[PDB]
Amino acid sequence: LKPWQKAFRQGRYAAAVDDVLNTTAPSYDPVIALTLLTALRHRSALREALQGRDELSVINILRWAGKYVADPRYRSICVDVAFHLIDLYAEHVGGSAELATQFQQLLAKVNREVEKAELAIVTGGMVESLMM
Amino acid sequence: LKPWQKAFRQGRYAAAVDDVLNTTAPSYDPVIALTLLTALRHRSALREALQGRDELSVINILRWAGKYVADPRYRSICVDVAFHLIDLYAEHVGGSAELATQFQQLLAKVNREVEKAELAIV
């Protein structure tokens, strides 16, 4: 059995999430992670699942979001997860510089998705002027 | 039982969208639009419902999304719609200033949301 399956059969639901989101596990399947995170959103429980975690769980989740945010299939949930973690733990970045960095790294990545989207638009205007 | 629901179950995804995003209708309901749009996303049908549209329809959907994106109930969907629309249409915005303008304005809000989160960390 994969660690996440055991975790779910026992009541260790917080651990379960850490298990599917563990990308360096041999049995890791990114699609499974996306599945669970999108399943929780569909069930209106994404926030609840994400709250009341210790610093290590949260950093790992931030990092997962950051790994996939630039992938058009994962981007929606990564963006959601980012915003959910902000509203939940932005008050606890005090007793940690390790947590405040991962937040920045993720937000920098999100801001880049927006900046890359801006270029896709404004370039057309640039090519327009150039061809005339 | 409603036309947008029938269009949906019948796979006329784009027609359902055109229904729920018609704000001039007595029964226009942002919550219904949200229900539909998320429903498409769950069926992996959102891109399909947004694709193959004329310029004016794209400008109108972008505009619709700008109106709810800051609301946490709608943000996730609205941001997706932005990205979906960018991927599908950004290449054609040459010589279409109105559309480029509309894209920029929606992005500006998506930007604003990211900024607010940055501000929450600091």
mmCIF file of C-alpha atoms in Angstrom:
data_model
loop_
_atom_site.group_PDB
_atom_site.id
_atom_site.type_symbol
_atom_site.label_atom_id
_atom_site.label_comp_id
_atom_site.label_asym_id
_atom_site.label_seq_id
_atom_site.Cartn_x
_atom_site.Cartn_y
_atom_site.Cartn_z
ATOM 1 C CA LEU A 1 0.000 0.000 0.000
ATOM 2 C CA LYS A 2 1.121 3.580 -0.720
ATOM 3 C CA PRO A 3 1.556 5.708 2.456
ATOM 4 C CA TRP A 4 -1.447 7.889 1.518
ATOM 5 C CA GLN A 5 -3.738 4.862 1.284
ATOM 6 C CA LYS A 6 -2.740 3.688 4.786
ATOM 7 C CA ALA A 7 -3.158 7.248 6.053
ATOM 8 C CA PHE A 8 -6.741 7.389 4.764
ATOM 9 C CA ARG A 9 -7.702 3.947 6.145
ATOM 10 C CA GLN A 10 -6.510 5.027 9.599
ATOM 11 C CA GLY A 11 -7.875 8.428 10.570
ATOM 12 C CA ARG A 12 -4.658 10.353 9.802
ATOM 13 C CA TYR A 13 -6.188 12.722 7.260
ATOM 14 C CA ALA A 14 -3.644 15.504 7.712
ATOM 15 C CA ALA A 15 -0.857 12.981 7.081
ATOM 16 C CA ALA A 16 -2.684 11.699 3.994
ATOM 17 C CA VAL A 17 -2.437 15.130 2.360
ATOM 18 C CA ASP A 18 1.256 15.310 3.163
ATOM 19 C CA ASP A 19 1.634 11.893 1.534
ATOM 20 C CA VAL A 20 -0.054 12.570 -1.843
ATOM 21 C CA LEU A 21 1.792 15.921 -2.009
ATOM 22 C CA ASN A 22 5.196 14.273 -1.390
ATOM 23 C CA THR A 23 6.823 14.536 -4.804
ATOM 24 C CA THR A 24 10.027 12.692 -3.940
ATOM 25 C CA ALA A 25 8.210 9.548 -2.859
ATOM 26 C CA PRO A 26 8.760 6.644 -5.329
ATOM 27 C CA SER A 27 5.036 6.018 -5.694
ATOM 28 C CA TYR A 28 4.223 9.723 -6.154
ATOM 29 C CA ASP A 29 1.668 10.520 -8.847
ATOM 30 C CA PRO A 30 1.172 14.239 -9.520
ATOM 31 C CA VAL A 31 -2.262 13.475 -11.013
ATOM 32 C CA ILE A 32 -3.328 11.881 -7.747
ATOM 33 C CA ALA A 33 -2.343 15.118 -5.918
ATOM 34 C CA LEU A 34 -4.274 17.245 -8.408
ATOM 35 C CA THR A 35 -7.181 14.829 -8.107
ATOM 36 C CA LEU A 36 -7.356 15.072 -4.285
ATOM 37 C CA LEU A 37 -6.858 18.846 -4.157
ATOM 38 C CA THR A 38 -9.516 19.364 -6.863
ATOM 39 C CA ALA A 39 -11.776 16.819 -5.126
ATOM 40 C CA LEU A 40 -11.606 18.799 -1.881
ATOM 41 C CA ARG A 41 -12.401 22.048 -3.743
ATOM 42 C CA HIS A 42 -15.405 20.435 -5.369
ATOM 43 C CA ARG A 43 -16.588 19.364 -1.920
ATOM 44 C CA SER A 44 -16.028 22.875 -0.495
ATOM 45 C CA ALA A 45 -13.469 21.568 1.971
ATOM 46 C CA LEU A 46 -10.175 22.766 0.475
ATOM 47 C CA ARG A 47 -9.817 25.497 3.052
ATOM 48 C CA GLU A 48 -10.733 23.280 5.988
ATOM 49 C CA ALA A 49 -8.271 20.635 4.848
ATOM 50 C CA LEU A 50 -5.589 23.294 4.700
ATOM 51 C CA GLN A 51 -6.161 24.837 8.134
ATOM 52 C CA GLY A 52 -4.638 23.929 11.482
ATOM 53 C CA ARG A 53 -1.447 22.462 10.022
ATOM 54 C CA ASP A 54 2.076 22.701 11.411
ATOM 55 C CA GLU A 55 4.780 24.728 9.688
ATOM 56 C CA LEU A 56 6.281 21.712 7.878
ATOM 57 C CA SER A 57 3.036 20.640 6.267
ATOM 58 C CA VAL A 58 2.392 24.196 5.065
ATOM 59 C CA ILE A 59 5.849 24.757 3.590
ATOM 60 C CA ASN A 60 5.561 21.455 1.725
ATOM 61 C CA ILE A 61 2.133 22.445 0.350
ATOM 62 C CA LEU A 62 3.422 25.879 -0.739
ATOM 63 C CA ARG A 63 6.323 24.127 -2.483
ATOM 64 C CA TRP A 64 3.951 21.749 -4.273
ATOM 65 C CA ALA A 65 1.843 24.669 -5.480
ATOM 66 C CA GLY A 66 5.091 26.284 -6.708
ATOM 67 C CA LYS A 67 6.150 23.199 -8.642
ATOM 68 C CA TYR A 68 3.003 23.162 -10.736
ATOM 69 C CA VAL A 69 1.564 26.701 -10.858
ATOM 70 C CA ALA A 70 3.168 27.173 -14.309
ATOM 71 C CA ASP A 71 1.431 24.044 -15.693
ATOM 72 C CA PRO A 72 -1.951 25.057 -17.298
ATOM 73 C CA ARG A 73 -3.568 21.893 -15.894
ATOM 74 C CA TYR A 74 -2.453 22.487 -12.278
ATOM 75 C CA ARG A 75 -2.448 26.298 -12.308
ATOM 76 C CA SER A 76 -6.046 26.822 -11.161
ATOM 77 C CA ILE A 77 -5.666 24.700 -8.030
ATOM 78 C CA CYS A 78 -2.129 26.012 -7.311
ATOM 79 C CA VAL A 79 -3.437 29.561 -7.478
ATOM 80 C CA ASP A 80 -6.382 28.633 -5.203
ATOM 81 C CA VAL A 81 -4.162 26.833 -2.733
ATOM 82 C CA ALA A 82 -1.795 29.842 -2.621
ATOM 83 C CA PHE A 83 -4.635 32.262 -1.748
ATOM 84 C CA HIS A 84 -6.102 29.822 0.794
ATOM 85 C CA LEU A 85 -2.750 29.516 2.574
ATOM 86 C CA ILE A 86 -2.292 33.299 2.610
ATOM 87 C CA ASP A 87 -5.619 33.993 4.331
ATOM 88 C CA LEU A 88 -4.836 31.198 6.840
ATOM 89 C CA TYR A 89 -1.172 31.577 7.760
ATOM 90 C CA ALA A 90 -0.180 35.182 6.895
ATOM 91 C CA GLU A 91 -0.353 35.802 10.645
ATOM 92 C CA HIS A 92 2.158 33.042 11.482
ATOM 93 C CA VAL A 93 4.998 34.151 9.191
ATOM 94 C CA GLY A 94 6.293 35.975 12.292
ATOM 95 C CA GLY A 95 7.831 33.007 14.096
ATOM 96 C CA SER A 96 9.425 31.814 10.840
ATOM 97 C CA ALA A 97 11.645 33.133 8.039
ATOM 98 C CA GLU A 98 11.578 29.671 6.442
ATOM 99 C CA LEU A 99 7.808 30.012 5.930
ATOM 100 C CA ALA A 100 7.921 33.630 4.774
ATOM 101 C CA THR A 101 10.397 32.725 2.053
ATOM 102 C CA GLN A 102 8.336 29.849 0.632
ATOM 103 C CA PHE A 103 5.345 32.216 0.483
ATOM 104 C CA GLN A 104 7.421 34.755 -1.475
ATOM 105 C CA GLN A 105 8.762 32.064 -3.788
ATOM 106 C CA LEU A 106 5.207 30.971 -4.545
ATOM 107 C CA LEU A 107 3.854 34.498 -4.959
ATOM 108 C CA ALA A 108 6.809 35.368 -7.192
ATOM 109 C CA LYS A 109 5.820 32.358 -9.293
ATOM 110 C CA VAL A 110 2.164 33.427 -9.358
ATOM 111 C CA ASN A 111 3.124 36.997 -10.289
ATOM 112 C CA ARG A 112 5.167 35.549 -13.126
ATOM 113 C CA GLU A 113 2.111 33.686 -14.459
ATOM 114 C CA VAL A 114 0.350 37.059 -14.577
ATOM 115 C CA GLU A 115 3.394 38.842 -16.108
ATOM 116 C CA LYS A 116 3.745 36.114 -18.753
ATOM 117 C CA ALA A 117 0.057 36.537 -19.515
ATOM 118 C CA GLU A 118 0.558 40.298 -19.894
ATOM 119 C CA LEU A 119 3.345 39.799 -22.478
ATOM 120 C CA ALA A 120 1.111 37.510 -24.563
ATOM 121 C CA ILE A 121 -1.309 40.440 -24.872
ATOM 122 C CA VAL A 122 0.917 43.488 -25.185
ATOM 123 C CA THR A 123 3.212 41.803 -27.736
ATOM 124 C CA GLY A 124 0.391 41.824 -30.304
ATOM 125 C CA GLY A 125 0.281 45.604 -29.979
ATOM 126 C CA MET A 126 4.043 45.670 -30.408
ATOM 127 C CA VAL A 127 3.964 43.456 -33.507
ATOM 128 C CA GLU A 128 1.147 45.698 -34.830
ATOM 129 C CA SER A 129 3.251 48.879 -34.612
ATOM 130 C CA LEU A 130 6.297 47.008 -35.998
ATOM 131 C CA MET A 131 4.523 45.758 -39.146
ATOM 132 C CA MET A 132 3.536 49.362 -39.905
ATOM 133 C CA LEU B 1 -35.398 22.102 -15.877
ATOM 134 C CA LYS B 2 -33.926 25.490 -16.923
ATOM 135 C CA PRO B 3 -32.547 26.207 -20.416
ATOM 136 C CA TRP B 4 -28.936 26.565 -19.192
ATOM 137 C CA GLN B 5 -29.292 23.218 -17.391
ATOM 138 C CA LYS B 6 -30.708 21.489 -20.477
ATOM 139 C CA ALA B 7 -27.987 23.001 -22.680
ATOM 140 C CA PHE B 8 -25.466 21.705 -20.147
ATOM 141 C CA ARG B 9 -26.635 18.095 -19.864
ATOM 142 C CA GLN B 10 -27.020 18.120 -23.679
ATOM 143 C CA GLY B 11 -23.359 19.172 -23.988
ATOM 144 C CA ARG B 12 -24.154 22.598 -25.472
ATOM 145 C CA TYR B 13 -21.574 24.037 -23.041
ATOM 146 C CA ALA B 14 -21.075 27.421 -24.793
ATOM 147 C CA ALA B 15 -24.842 27.983 -25.017
ATOM 148 C CA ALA B 16 -25.219 27.430 -21.288
ATOM 149 C CA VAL B 17 -22.481 30.018 -20.730
ATOM 150 C CA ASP B 18 -24.200 32.535 -23.016
ATOM 151 C CA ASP B 19 -27.328 31.938 -20.937
ATOM 152 C CA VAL B 20 -25.948 32.432 -17.500
ATOM 153 C CA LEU B 21 -23.783 35.410 -18.536
ATOM 154 C CA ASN B 22 -26.680 37.336 -20.045
ATOM 155 C CA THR B 23 -26.962 40.078 -17.391
ATOM 156 C CA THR B 24 -29.928 41.764 -19.064
ATOM 157 C CA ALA B 25 -32.196 38.811 -18.126
ATOM 158 C CA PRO B 26 -34.619 38.986 -15.168
ATOM 159 C CA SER B 27 -33.174 35.715 -13.933
ATOM 160 C CA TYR B 28 -29.477 36.520 -14.307
ATOM 161 C CA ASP B 29 -27.771 35.231 -11.161
ATOM 162 C CA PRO B 30 -24.017 35.479 -10.502
ATOM 163 C CA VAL B 31 -24.337 32.399 -8.247
ATOM 164 C CA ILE B 32 -25.910 30.431 -11.089
ATOM 165 C CA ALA B 33 -23.138 31.526 -13.441
ATOM 166 C CA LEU B 34 -20.642 30.389 -10.813
ATOM 167 C CA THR B 35 -22.388 27.024 -10.513
ATOM 168 C CA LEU B 36 -22.280 26.510 -14.277
ATOM 169 C CA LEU B 37 -18.689 27.713 -14.806
ATOM 170 C CA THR B 38 -17.343 25.557 -12.000
ATOM 171 C CA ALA B 39 -19.437 22.660 -13.340
ATOM 172 C CA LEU B 40 -17.681 22.952 -16.714
ATOM 173 C CA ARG B 41 -14.297 23.081 -14.931
ATOM 174 C CA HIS B 42 -15.109 19.859 -13.036
ATOM 175 C CA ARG B 43 -16.062 18.234 -16.370
ATOM 176 C CA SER B 44 -12.903 19.662 -17.987
ATOM 177 C CA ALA B 45 -15.250 21.495 -20.417
ATOM 178 C CA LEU B 46 -14.518 25.134 -19.528
ATOM 179 C CA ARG B 47 -11.942 25.673 -22.268
ATOM 180 C CA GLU B 48 -14.376 24.213 -24.795
ATOM 181 C CA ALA B 49 -17.186 26.531 -23.716
ATOM 182 C CA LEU B 50 -14.845 29.529 -24.010
ATOM 183 C CA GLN B 51 -13.218 28.556 -27.315
ATOM 184 C CA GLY B 52 -14.326 29.402 -30.864
ATOM 185 C CA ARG B 53 -15.914 32.735 -29.994
ATOM 186 C CA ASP B 54 -15.960 36.033 -31.845
ATOM 187 C CA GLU B 55 -14.091 39.083 -30.539
ATOM 188 C CA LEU B 56 -17.167 40.748 -29.005
ATOM 189 C CA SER B 57 -18.125 37.699 -26.972
ATOM 190 C CA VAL B 58 -14.575 37.536 -25.595
ATOM 191 C CA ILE B 59 -14.601 41.214 -24.565
ATOM 192 C CA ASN B 60 -17.933 40.597 -22.800
ATOM 193 C CA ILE B 61 -16.784 37.552 -20.833
ATOM 194 C CA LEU B 62 -13.578 39.312 -19.729
ATOM 195 C CA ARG B 63 -15.710 42.248 -18.616
ATOM 196 C CA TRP B 64 -18.131 39.982 -16.782
ATOM 197 C CA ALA B 65 -15.225 38.343 -14.928
ATOM 198 C CA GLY B 66 -13.717 41.671 -13.810
ATOM 199 C CA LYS B 67 -16.933 42.292 -11.897
ATOM 200 C CA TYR B 68 -16.564 39.345 -9.508
ATOM 201 C CA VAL B 69 -12.870 38.425 -9.457
ATOM 202 C CA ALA B 70 -12.104 40.234 -6.198
ATOM 203 C CA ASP B 71 -14.990 38.390 -4.448
ATOM 204 C CA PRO B 72 -13.485 35.267 -2.811
ATOM 205 C CA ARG B 73 -16.518 33.166 -3.872
ATOM 206 C CA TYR B 74 -15.794 33.945 -7.551
ATOM 207 C CA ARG B 75 -11.996 34.559 -7.660
ATOM 208 C CA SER B 76 -10.891 31.033 -8.568
ATOM 209 C CA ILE B 77 -13.272 30.773 -11.529
ATOM 210 C CA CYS B 78 -12.632 34.309 -12.746
ATOM 211 C CA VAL B 79 -8.858 33.837 -12.717
ATOM 212 C CA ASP B 80 -9.235 30.581 -14.672
ATOM 213 C CA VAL B 81 -11.442 32.268 -17.207
ATOM 214 C CA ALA B 82 -8.750 34.948 -17.645
ATOM 215 C CA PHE B 83 -6.036 32.342 -18.260
ATOM 216 C CA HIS B 84 -8.264 30.203 -20.493
ATOM 217 C CA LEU B 85 -9.130 33.313 -22.497
ATOM 218 C CA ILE B 86 -5.469 34.456 -22.635
ATOM 219 C CA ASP B 87 -4.282 31.060 -23.931
ATOM 220 C CA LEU B 88 -7.088 30.831 -26.480
ATOM 221 C CA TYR B 89 -7.110 34.424 -27.730
ATOM 222 C CA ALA B 90 -4.009 36.439 -26.797
ATOM 223 C CA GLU B 91 -2.308 35.745 -30.156
ATOM 224 C CA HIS B 92 -5.127 37.448 -32.096
ATOM 225 C CA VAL B 93 -5.130 40.763 -30.170
ATOM 226 C CA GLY B 94 -3.061 42.455 -32.889
ATOM 227 C CA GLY B 95 -5.058 45.268 -34.490
ATOM 228 C CA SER B 96 -7.818 44.728 -31.941
ATOM 229 C CA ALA B 97 -7.234 47.478 -29.392
ATOM 230 C CA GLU B 98 -10.630 47.102 -27.664
ATOM 231 C CA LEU B 99 -9.876 43.418 -26.941
ATOM 232 C CA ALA B 100 -6.306 44.089 -25.893
ATOM 233 C CA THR B 101 -7.690 46.783 -23.604
ATOM 234 C CA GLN B 102 -10.243 44.400 -22.107
ATOM 235 C CA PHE B 103 -7.606 41.731 -21.531
ATOM 236 C CA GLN B 104 -5.314 44.253 -19.848
ATOM 237 C CA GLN B 105 -8.014 45.475 -17.482
ATOM 238 C CA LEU B 106 -8.910 41.997 -16.312
ATOM 239 C CA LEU B 107 -5.238 41.185 -15.760
ATOM 240 C CA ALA B 108 -4.837 44.385 -13.758
ATOM 241 C CA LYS B 109 -7.376 43.035 -11.259
ATOM 242 C CA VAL B 110 -5.740 39.593 -11.199
ATOM 243 C CA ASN B 111 -2.536 41.466 -10.470
ATOM 244 C CA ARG B 112 -4.272 43.463 -7.709
ATOM 245 C CA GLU B 113 -5.243 40.171 -6.007
ATOM 246 C CA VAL B 114 -1.654 38.906 -6.068
ATOM 247 C CA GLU B 115 -0.412 42.237 -4.686
ATOM 248 C CA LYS B 116 -2.929 42.085 -1.791
ATOM 249 C CA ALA B 117 -1.575 38.649 -0.868
ATOM 250 C CA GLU B 118 2.026 39.977 -0.990
ATOM 251 C CA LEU B 119 0.886 42.746 1.355
ATOM 252 C CA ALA B 120 -0.575 40.163 3.714
ATOM 253 C CA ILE B 121 2.817 38.439 4.001
ATOM 254 C CA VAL B 122 4.491 41.744 4.837
#
